[PDB]
Amino acid sequence: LACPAERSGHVAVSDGRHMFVWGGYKSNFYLPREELWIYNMETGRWKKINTEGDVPPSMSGSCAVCVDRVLYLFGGHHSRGNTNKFYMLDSRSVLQWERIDCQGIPPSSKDKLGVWVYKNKLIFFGGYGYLPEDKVLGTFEFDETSFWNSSHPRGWNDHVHILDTETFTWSQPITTGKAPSPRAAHACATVGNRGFVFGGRYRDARMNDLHYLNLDTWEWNELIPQGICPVGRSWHSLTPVSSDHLFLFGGFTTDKQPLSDAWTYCISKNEWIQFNHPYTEKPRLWHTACASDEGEVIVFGGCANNLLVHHRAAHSNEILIFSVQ
Ligand SMILES: O=C(O)CNC(=O)Cc1csc(-c2ccc3ccccc3c2)n1
């Protein structure tokens, strides 16, 4: 049966029963832009389709959502750099991509960010990319390691941007509270009107902090769980599994250890619980995770070692199924 190629930095979005996989890169360039891979969470079978229309460039680090079987794609890194273009693919009724001429001030061109979905709003936070074209709300910190290797320097931001799907208009909310530090390769998860974010890379650390932005008031809150917390990391996944639990898997520590640990964050108790699973010998970073209607968390792709050593990188095509409910 047909089987998608290994990759990291891809996107994966789900309607609870089907998982849509697009993009990413591997070793041994970018996976083909026109392909969309569909994994049936109930039958474990893959199915590939060719998409047409305004097919986005081949990219790593893009940020995607699925809302009522409409897929939206923002940002990423292609052969000629980062982007801030916005695409839509309606997976309801050959599938055609639409590139949206958004109104308003878009985010800076960037990748490795996250998104919360709340009613008509797609809310994007953070990431890695070029200096912004405007003194938009937030801060931006250059990554000094990008000064002497490329032609365009890059850095981290803490920006929050709203894409309103009633009008495809970009805006930025005026927030209160301590926003998280600028960061990339963090993970975001949404429960109700709370947009959680955990970890990420910033300057010389991969972080262990946990915050949530209230998506109704726009007030930041930093969460301080008691007792043992997971080690700081980037390139991990964070996924809602109930109205009270976020599921964490994998990532990459400050001192460059690939991770195979898994935790559940209980929101009501403000406590982490380590989760026991049979994939302890399968660390993953820059994988994706999607929750199914059937209580599972489906992890796909990602790299089993330090992907920054690109000629030795072990990118995966495996499906890891976590039975959290
Ligand atoms: O460092 C983190 O945890 C997340 N990264 C950042 O925040 C910014 C950054 C700075 S360089 C880089 C990066 C990414 C992927 C690569 C894949 C192959 C080869 C080199 C690669 C280099 N990313």
- Rounded Cα distance between 136 and 160, Å, is 10
Atom 15 in ligand 1: which residue has the minimum CA distance? 308
How is residue 42 written in tokens?
Answer: 């109930």
Resolution (A): 1.7
Which ligand 1 atom sits nearest the alpha carbon of residue 184? Answer: 7
State the SS3 of the chain. CCCCCCCECCEEEECCCEEEEECCECCCCECCCCEEEEEECCCCCEEEEECEECCCCCCECCEEEEECCEEEEECCEECCEECCCEEEEECCCCCEEEECCCECCCCCCEECCEEEEECCEEEEEEEEECCCCCCCCCCEEECHHHCCCCCCCCEEEEEEEEEECCCCEEECCCCECCCCCCCECCEEEEECCEEEEECCEECCEECCCEEEEECCCCEEEEECCCCCCCCCCECCEEEEEECCEEEEECCECCCCCECCCEEEEECCCCEEEECCCCCCCCCCECCEEEECCCCEEEEECCECCCCCCHHHCCECCCEEEEECC
Best CA proximity match to 262, nearest among 241, 287, 245, 279: 279
Given a contact cutoff of 8 angstroms between Cβ atoms, the answer to whether 237 and 279 are in contact is: no
Given a contact cutoff of 8 angstroms between Cβ atoms, the answer to whether 194 and 215 are in contact is: yes
Q: Which of 8, 201, 206, 311 to mutate to test the pocket of ligand 1 (most atoms within 8 A of CB)?
A: 201
Atom 13 in ligand 1: which residue has the minimum CA distance? 308
Atom 23 in ligand 1: which residue has the minimum CA distance? 128
What values do phi and psi take at 312, rounded to 5? -110, 0
Every domain of the chain and the residues it spans:
2-324
Given a contact cutoff of 8 angstroms between Cβ atoms, the answer to whether 184 and 252 are in contact is: no
Atom 19 in ligand 1: which residue has the minimum CA distance? 308
Residue 149: CB partners within 8 Å, gap ≥ 6? none
- Rounded Cα distance between 319 and 172, Å, is 37
Tell me, in angstroms, the distance from the centre of ligand 1 to residue 111's CA: 10
Best CA proximity match to 13, nearest among 30, 36, 46, 35: 36
Best CA proximity match to 126, nearest among 195, 200, 64: 200
* Distance set, CA 317 to CA 31, 216, 251, 301, 302 (Å): 12, 38, 17, 5, 8
How is residue 241 written in tokens?
Answer: 């599994």
Q: Burial-class residue 22 by CB neighbours within 10 Å (0-12, 13-18, 19+).
A: buried
Given a contact cutoff of 8 angstroms between Cβ atoms, the answer to whether 14 and 292 are in contact is: yes
Q: Which of 112, 203, 206 to mutate to test the pocket of ligand 1 (most atoms within 8 A of CB)?
A: 112
How is residue 280 written in tokens?
Answer: 């302890």
Q: How far is CA 217 from its chain centroid?
A: 24
Furthest-apart CA atoms within the chain: distance in Å: 52
Which ligand 1 atom sits nearest the alpha carbon of residue 309? Answer: 19
Tell me, in angstroms, the distance from the centre of ligand 1 to residue 322's CA: 27
Which ligand 1 atom sits nearest the alpha carbon of residue 156? Answer: 7
Q: Burial-class residue 130 by CB neighbours within 10 Å (0-12, 13-18, 19+).
A: middle
Best CA proximity match to 285, nearest among 111, 158, 112, 82: 112
Given a contact cutoff of 8 angstroms between Cβ atoms, the answer to whether 21 and 47 are in contact is: no
- Rounded Cα distance between 71 and 194, Å, is 22
Atom 22 in ligand 1: which residue has the minimum CA distance? 308
Tell me, in angstroms, the distance from the centre of ligand 1 to residue 308's CA: 7
Residue found by looking up tokens 């809602």 in the block:
240
Tell me, in angstroms, the distance from the centre of ligand 1 to residue 193's CA: 31
- Output the ligand 1 site: residues, CB below 6 A: 112, 128, 143, 184-185, 201, 206, 234-235, 252, 307-308, 310
Residue 83: CB partners within 8 Å, gap ≥ 6? 57, 59, 75, 76, 77, 109
- Rounded Cα distance between 262 and 239, Å, is 11
- Rounded Cα distance between 263 and 277, Å, is 10
Which ligand 1 atom sits nearest the alpha carbon of residue 25? Answer: 17
Tell me, in angstroms, the distance from the centre of ligand 1 to residue 204's CA: 12
CA atoms within 13 A on the CB side of 119: 7
